[PDB]
From a paper:
A clear solution was obtained and the structure was refined to final Rwork/Rfree values of 18.8%/20.9% to 2.30 Å resolution. The apo MERS1 adopts a different crystal form with distinct packing compared to the MERS1–GDP structure and as a result we did not see the fortuitously bound helix in the apo structure. Comparison of the apo and GDP bound MERS1 structure revealed that the N-domain and most of the C-domain have the same structure; the two structures can be superimposed with a rmsd of 0.9 Å for 260 corresponding Cα atoms. There is, however, a notable difference between the two structures at the base of C-domain near the GDP binding pocket. Specifically, in the apo structure density was absent for the region encompassing residues 354–380. This region contains key residues involved in nucleotide binding, including Arg356, Tyr360, Arg364, and Tyr365. This appears to be explained by the apo MERS1 structure, which revealed that a key part of the RNA binding region is disordered in the apo state.
The 5′ ends are processed by a pyrophosphohydrolase complex termed the PPsome, which is composed of the so-called mitochondrial edited mRNA stability factors 1–3 (MERS1–MERS3). Interestingly, the MERS1 Nudix motif (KWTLLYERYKEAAIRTLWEETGI) lacks one of the key metal ion coordinating acidic residues, which in MERS1 is a threonine instead of an acidic residue. The MERS1 structure reveals that it is comprised of two α−β domains.
Residue numbers in the entry: 77 to 90, 94, 96 to 144, 156 to 353
Write the structure that this text describes.
Amino acid sequence: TIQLEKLSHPPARFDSFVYKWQTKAALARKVSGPMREWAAELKYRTGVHIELEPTYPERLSENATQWGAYETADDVDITVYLFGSERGIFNCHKLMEAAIQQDPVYVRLGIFRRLANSSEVEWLMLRRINRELRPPDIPPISLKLPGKWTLLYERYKEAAIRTLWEETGITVDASNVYPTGHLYQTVPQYYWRVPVRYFVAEVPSDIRVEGPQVVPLQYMRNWDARLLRQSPDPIDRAWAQLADPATGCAWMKASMIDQLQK
């Protein structure tokens, strides 16, 4: 249950009808998302614009009650504002109640191939170029397994399979896709962070990879291999060596990644 409070006007910091939801990050992150994955979907569905802020931001600068550090990100007090029509807000409210009962997450579908000469498998990876307006925990370029996030009402595996296709053009069958758990590592200051659900699936080693089918320009592609292999960054050089500039994808071993980080 979400209790909304109607406001007469927005506060000055937010320069339509306005409602407020006073809650915790444990719930607020489900209607927002680090990159507004869910906020944008809510806007798409209802026209309602969502804004979030920590209610007591000074507490986020504390290391050590009722006025010191928060124990966990989940405990962070969050004030959510909704701007829209009465009808949009009515509809958006309904969607949020459903969302906080779902568990919207990031998904990663680890596509892997087996090499004859090796017991360690190779993982398909991409490098996503991130926007200039991004939370501080996200680097300029994310090296990642394929996969994005669950849409509202979407099941985990369904989302993994759909977003694998969006990033790589690869179609896998659900019966070959295996969930393998989740990771969720965060701190109170990064209260927006969400769990990541993992899956694995084997593909044949000679499978044809097309690359991103959706927003392809948000991924590294068509770099200058000669130039990039002169980068001071070990990942850049491994990327120039192993990635296909036409697809923005590389087959990589975790052990090789570990050796680069030393």
